[PDB]
């Protein structure tokens, strides 16, 4: 039923400012401050799993930024994506100068993309004979345990498996099914998510790949701990031969091409590009 | 109950000979011909899944050989591993000159290693606090479908998922559990194999890795088709935090460090080295 908004911002600093950790935080502030799109405040605060927001890392030139001072007026890029009602579009700032605790910046909207989720399925249909390339252009954090049998999840709820620096196709499409579900309002999925993921990496073929684990700062604590974490970057190209599972997976992946993948996407992690090639 | 034999051969050609496809075939001939270890004939012919043999590819210097002429008397290496009764040890050739349809070669035994499977568990115990590095030194072929839900295996028995050029830890330990099972005589495992594999990659952490897909010839047909295939080479290092699943997996991996991994190991594919490091 609802729709997705993908807003492309050009950010420019107004002095020499030292970027915080990670970059995305600067705009996060502006949302919690309500200086830009106050409506989203609630949806930022929401600790609900698989929430539909994405405040990307700040991108210089072509690539994002991960663990250091920035020139006076360098041309930066960013992307915020989310989903509520078209009403919010009445109050998005379009232009402006905002101060933060970091500094002051000139925000100018470069692009706007709005689409309905059901309109995506149409796009899903024309790729049922293309190979699927998923490209992480941001540090992506995928837990392995989301693929643990739902039942048994109590027993092993003691030990932390961390983040699969080497992710299976099933894990990613499970996550995309999670965000797709929490989007269209579909409670209790983890069993279906599970079963679908197992089903997926069980009968899907990796065509080619380049991945590599990455260590990134996700922000200092209050008490002083500079939190670091392990994730995975690079691209992975594969295919699924079963028509059903393909159509479903494409329909979830398209969603992730906006809202991102895994967690925590509320801070720029999991940003992906989705590419296609023929046979 | 039984035990494993790992025989290290030094092979030398007696003229200039053109190696066949793959290399391992040359010794395979000698087993079917019974020229070397006739007893193994039966166990070569056996198309039983997860049979306990391994006729490695011929290794020049340090590394195996995959898709071309060889000098008169170059010093080659090979390893044949398997499991039957100590009786066979009475008739292993030790030394000799054998002719083939390929040519004639001088075989000299360089090393002998015999161990009992229960003796392995002792070795398993002293690593419960080491990281596990699995190194494929041969093209390894792992099907993804071995991780499909046993029940549902009928429905999707139509489409071929091929070989996971990107393997999950679960897939490999599932395979090792398969060979370990068919070894000690333990019928009907695929459900336990399944459940164990899912359980494994669900709560295991990849520490580091380097993998890359490889295309290798597995032999021309009769009708003339030079069969090629996709597999995976490189190393992958990981760990499992649950004590139980670790002890089990180590106990299966040790077995695979002899009998090899996946299929088809009857021709040198799946040869691995198992390494350990502290924390």
Short mmCIF file of C-alpha atoms in Angstrom, two decimals, chain A residues 1-262:
data_model
loop_
_atom_site.label_atom_id
_atom_site.label_comp_id
_atom_site.label_asym_id
_atom_site.label_seq_id
_atom_site.Cartn_x
_atom_site.Cartn_y
_atom_site.Cartn_z
CA UNK A 1 0.00 0.00 0.00
CA UNK A 2 2.44 2.71 0.94
CA UNK A 3 5.32 4.21 -1.00
CA UNK A 4 9.03 4.90 -0.75
CA UNK A 5 10.80 8.26 -0.90
CA UNK A 6 14.46 8.48 -1.95
CA UNK A 7 15.90 11.97 -1.49
CA UNK A 8 19.28 12.87 -2.94
CA UNK A 9 20.98 15.72 -1.08
CA UNK A 10 24.04 17.78 -2.01
CA UNK A 11 25.67 18.81 1.24
CA UNK A 12 28.24 21.61 1.50
CA UNK A 13 30.13 22.56 4.72
CA UNK A 14 30.38 26.31 5.39
CA UNK A 15 33.74 26.21 7.15
CA UNK A 16 36.41 23.65 7.86
CA UNK A 17 34.65 21.03 9.96
CA UNK A 18 35.79 17.71 11.44
CA UNK A 19 33.39 14.89 10.46
CA UNK A 20 31.87 12.77 13.27
CA UNK A 21 31.45 8.99 13.52
CA UNK A 22 30.05 7.89 11.33
CA UNK A 23 29.37 10.60 8.74
CA UNK A 24 25.58 10.02 8.53
CA UNK A 25 25.16 11.30 12.12
CA UNK A 26 25.22 14.92 10.94
CA UNK A 27 21.89 14.56 9.16
CA UNK A 28 20.53 12.26 11.91
CA UNK A 29 20.92 15.20 14.27
CA UNK A 30 18.91 17.37 11.86
CA UNK A 31 16.06 14.83 11.91
CA UNK A 32 15.98 14.52 15.69
CA UNK A 33 16.26 18.30 15.86
CA UNK A 34 13.51 18.37 13.25
CA UNK A 35 15.48 21.07 11.44
CA UNK A 36 14.99 18.97 8.32
CA UNK A 37 11.85 16.84 7.89
CA UNK A 38 10.57 16.97 11.51
CA UNK A 39 7.91 14.36 10.76
CA UNK A 40 10.56 11.63 10.54
CA UNK A 41 11.54 12.21 14.18
CA UNK A 42 9.23 9.47 15.48
CA UNK A 43 10.39 7.01 12.89
CA UNK A 44 14.06 7.72 13.74
CA UNK A 45 13.44 7.09 17.46
CA UNK A 46 11.61 3.85 16.73
CA UNK A 47 13.90 1.00 17.72
CA UNK A 48 11.50 -1.34 15.92
CA UNK A 49 13.45 -3.93 13.94
CA UNK A 50 13.66 -3.37 10.18
CA UNK A 51 12.35 0.20 10.33
CA UNK A 52 11.99 1.90 6.92
CA UNK A 53 14.71 4.60 7.08
CA UNK A 54 18.18 5.06 5.64
CA UNK A 55 20.40 8.03 6.41
CA UNK A 56 23.40 7.29 4.21
CA UNK A 57 27.03 8.06 4.99
CA UNK A 58 28.29 11.31 3.47
CA UNK A 59 29.74 10.60 0.04
CA UNK A 60 32.71 12.48 -1.38
CA UNK A 61 32.84 12.34 -5.17
CA UNK A 62 31.87 8.71 -5.77
CA UNK A 63 32.45 6.72 -2.59
CA UNK A 64 31.25 6.79 1.03
CA UNK A 65 33.38 7.48 4.11
CA UNK A 66 34.56 5.22 6.95
CA UNK A 67 37.53 5.36 9.40
CA UNK A 68 40.10 13.39 8.46
CA UNK A 69 39.32 17.10 8.10
CA UNK A 70 37.23 18.62 5.30
CA UNK A 71 37.72 21.76 3.20
CA UNK A 72 35.60 24.87 3.43
CA UNK A 73 33.14 24.31 0.60
CA UNK A 74 33.65 20.85 -0.87
CA UNK A 75 30.77 19.36 -2.82
CA UNK A 76 29.38 16.40 -0.84
CA UNK A 77 26.59 13.93 -1.57
CA UNK A 78 24.06 11.99 0.52
CA UNK A 79 20.85 10.00 0.26
CA UNK A 80 18.03 9.66 2.73
CA UNK A 81 15.33 7.11 2.00
CA UNK A 82 12.21 6.22 3.97
CA UNK A 83 8.48 5.63 3.87
CA UNK A 84 5.48 7.45 5.30
CA UNK A 85 2.82 9.63 3.68
CA UNK A 86 3.03 12.10 0.76
CA UNK A 87 1.99 14.78 3.28
CA UNK A 88 5.59 15.02 4.54
CA UNK A 89 6.55 16.28 1.10
CA UNK A 90 4.80 19.55 2.02
CA UNK A 91 7.48 20.37 4.58
CA UNK A 92 10.80 18.93 3.33
CA UNK A 93 13.20 21.89 3.37
CA UNK A 94 14.25 21.96 -0.35
CA UNK A 95 17.02 24.44 0.47
CA UNK A 96 18.84 25.80 3.46
CA UNK A 97 21.60 26.53 5.91
CA UNK A 98 21.54 24.47 9.08
CA UNK A 99 23.75 24.71 12.13
CA UNK A 100 24.68 21.62 14.13
CA UNK A 101 26.91 20.82 17.10
CA UNK A 102 29.36 19.75 14.40
CA UNK A 103 29.16 23.00 12.43
CA UNK A 104 26.99 24.68 9.83
CA UNK A 105 26.20 23.26 6.39
CA UNK A 106 24.43 24.27 3.21
CA UNK A 107 21.92 21.59 2.20
CA UNK A 108 20.45 21.65 -1.33
CA UNK A 109 18.14 18.92 -2.64
CA UNK A 110 19.55 17.49 -5.88
CA UNK A 111 17.06 14.71 -6.60
CA UNK A 112 13.66 13.30 -5.62
CA UNK A 113 12.39 9.79 -6.31
CA UNK A 114 8.97 8.53 -5.20
CA UNK A 115 7.52 5.10 -6.02
CA UNK A 116 4.77 2.77 -4.76
CA UNK A 117 5.70 -0.73 -3.58
CA UNK A 118 3.17 -2.39 -5.88
CA UNK A 119 4.67 -0.50 -8.83
CA UNK A 120 7.92 -2.32 -8.06
CA UNK A 121 6.46 -5.71 -8.98
CA UNK A 122 6.09 -4.46 -12.56
CA UNK A 123 9.83 -3.85 -12.59
CA UNK A 124 10.35 -7.27 -10.99
CA UNK A 125 8.69 -8.96 -13.95
CA UNK A 126 11.14 -7.77 -16.64
CA UNK A 127 14.23 -9.22 -14.96
CA UNK A 128 13.15 -12.85 -14.53
CA UNK A 129 15.88 -13.75 -17.05
CA UNK A 130 18.73 -11.54 -15.84
CA UNK A 131 21.55 -12.39 -13.42
CA UNK A 132 21.42 -10.57 -10.10
CA UNK A 133 24.39 -8.52 -8.90
CA UNK A 134 24.26 -7.12 -5.38
CA UNK A 135 26.86 -4.46 -4.67
CA UNK A 136 27.52 -3.28 -1.14
CA UNK A 137 28.84 0.26 -1.37
CA UNK A 138 28.66 0.68 2.39
CA UNK A 139 29.85 -1.49 5.28
CA UNK A 140 27.08 -4.10 5.54
CA UNK A 141 26.22 -5.80 8.82
CA UNK A 142 24.40 -9.10 8.60
CA UNK A 143 23.90 -11.33 11.64
CA UNK A 144 24.08 -15.08 10.95
CA UNK A 145 21.56 -15.92 13.68
CA UNK A 146 18.65 -14.44 11.74
CA UNK A 147 18.92 -17.75 9.87
CA UNK A 148 18.75 -19.90 13.03
CA UNK A 149 15.63 -22.13 13.38
CA UNK A 150 12.98 -19.91 15.07
CA UNK A 151 12.04 -22.62 17.57
CA UNK A 152 15.57 -23.41 18.71
CA UNK A 153 16.34 -19.65 18.98
CA UNK A 154 15.84 -19.80 22.73
CA UNK A 155 18.49 -22.42 23.42
CA UNK A 156 21.36 -20.70 21.62
CA UNK A 157 20.16 -17.20 22.54
CA UNK A 158 23.22 -17.12 24.82
CA UNK A 159 26.14 -16.85 22.40
CA UNK A 160 26.78 -14.03 19.88
CA UNK A 161 27.64 -15.19 16.34
CA UNK A 162 28.45 -11.62 15.27
CA UNK A 163 28.26 -10.47 11.65
CA UNK A 164 28.71 -12.85 8.72
CA UNK A 165 31.67 -11.17 6.99
CA UNK A 166 30.92 -13.86 4.42
CA UNK A 167 27.15 -13.75 3.74
CA UNK A 168 25.02 -16.44 2.07
CA UNK A 169 22.40 -15.41 -0.49
CA UNK A 170 19.78 -16.76 1.88
CA UNK A 171 20.88 -14.38 4.62
CA UNK A 172 20.52 -11.29 2.44
CA UNK A 173 17.16 -12.24 0.92
CA UNK A 174 15.96 -13.13 4.42
CA UNK A 175 16.86 -9.63 5.55
CA UNK A 176 15.19 -8.06 2.48
CA UNK A 177 12.09 -10.13 3.22
CA UNK A 178 12.24 -8.77 6.77
CA UNK A 179 12.28 -5.09 5.72
CA UNK A 180 9.73 -5.80 3.00
CA UNK A 181 7.48 -7.42 5.61
CA UNK A 182 7.82 -4.72 8.30
CA UNK A 183 7.16 -2.22 5.51
CA UNK A 184 3.80 -3.48 4.19
CA UNK A 185 2.72 -4.32 7.73
CA UNK A 186 3.22 -8.06 8.02
CA UNK A 187 3.89 -9.19 11.59
CA UNK A 188 5.40 -12.57 12.54
CA UNK A 189 7.73 -13.42 9.66
CA UNK A 190 10.91 -14.84 11.24
CA UNK A 191 9.72 -18.40 10.59
CA UNK A 192 8.81 -17.60 6.98
CA UNK A 193 11.97 -15.48 6.77
CA UNK A 194 14.01 -18.44 8.04
CA UNK A 195 12.41 -21.02 5.76
CA UNK A 196 12.72 -18.72 2.77
CA UNK A 197 16.41 -18.04 3.44
CA UNK A 198 17.34 -21.68 3.85
CA UNK A 199 15.27 -22.47 0.76
CA UNK A 200 17.15 -19.71 -1.04
CA UNK A 201 20.82 -20.45 -0.45
CA UNK A 202 19.94 -24.14 -0.77
CA UNK A 203 19.02 -23.84 -4.47
CA UNK A 204 20.66 -20.65 -5.74
CA UNK A 205 23.92 -20.47 -7.67
CA UNK A 206 26.61 -17.88 -7.00
CA UNK A 207 27.84 -16.80 -10.44
CA UNK A 208 30.80 -14.68 -9.43
CA UNK A 209 31.94 -12.60 -6.48
CA UNK A 210 34.31 -10.26 -4.75
CA UNK A 211 33.80 -9.74 -1.03
CA UNK A 212 36.06 -8.60 1.78
CA UNK A 213 35.48 -8.02 5.53
CA UNK A 214 35.80 -4.46 6.80
CA UNK A 215 36.30 -2.92 10.24
CA UNK A 216 34.39 0.34 10.75
CA UNK A 217 33.71 2.75 13.60
CA UNK A 218 29.99 3.05 14.42
CA UNK A 219 30.47 5.83 16.97
CA UNK A 220 32.02 6.49 20.35
CA UNK A 221 29.96 5.54 23.41
CA UNK A 222 29.12 8.07 26.11
CA UNK A 223 31.55 6.43 28.54
CA UNK A 224 34.22 6.70 25.86
CA UNK A 225 34.28 3.48 23.88
CA UNK A 226 34.90 4.00 20.17
CA UNK A 227 32.68 1.19 18.93
CA UNK A 228 34.14 -0.72 16.00
CA UNK A 229 32.60 -3.61 14.05
CA UNK A 230 33.15 -6.28 11.39
CA UNK A 231 31.11 -6.28 8.19
CA UNK A 232 31.37 -7.08 4.49
CA UNK A 233 31.96 -4.97 1.38
CA UNK A 234 32.13 -5.74 -2.32
CA UNK A 235 29.78 -7.27 -4.87
CA UNK A 236 28.23 -10.72 -5.32
CA UNK A 237 26.48 -11.94 -8.44
CA UNK A 238 24.17 -14.92 -8.49
CA UNK A 239 20.95 -16.37 -9.89
CA UNK A 240 17.92 -18.38 -8.78
CA UNK A 241 16.41 -20.97 -11.14
CA UNK A 242 13.03 -21.50 -9.40
CA UNK A 243 10.61 -18.94 -10.87
CA UNK A 244 8.68 -18.40 -7.63
CA UNK A 245 11.61 -17.80 -5.30
CA UNK A 246 13.17 -15.55 -7.92
CA UNK A 247 10.11 -13.33 -8.33
CA UNK A 248 9.82 -13.05 -4.53
CA UNK A 249 13.53 -12.33 -4.01
CA UNK A 250 13.61 -9.68 -6.75
CA UNK A 251 10.55 -8.13 -5.15
CA UNK A 252 12.40 -7.89 -1.81
CA UNK A 253 15.74 -6.83 -3.28
CA UNK A 254 14.18 -3.91 -5.11
CA UNK A 255 12.91 -2.70 -1.74
CA UNK A 256 16.39 -3.07 -0.31
CA UNK A 257 17.76 -1.00 -3.21
CA UNK A 258 16.09 1.89 -1.43
CA UNK A 259 15.76 1.08 2.24
CA UNK A 260 19.08 -0.75 2.35
CA UNK A 261 20.02 -4.12 3.81
CA UNK A 262 20.47 -5.68 7.23
#
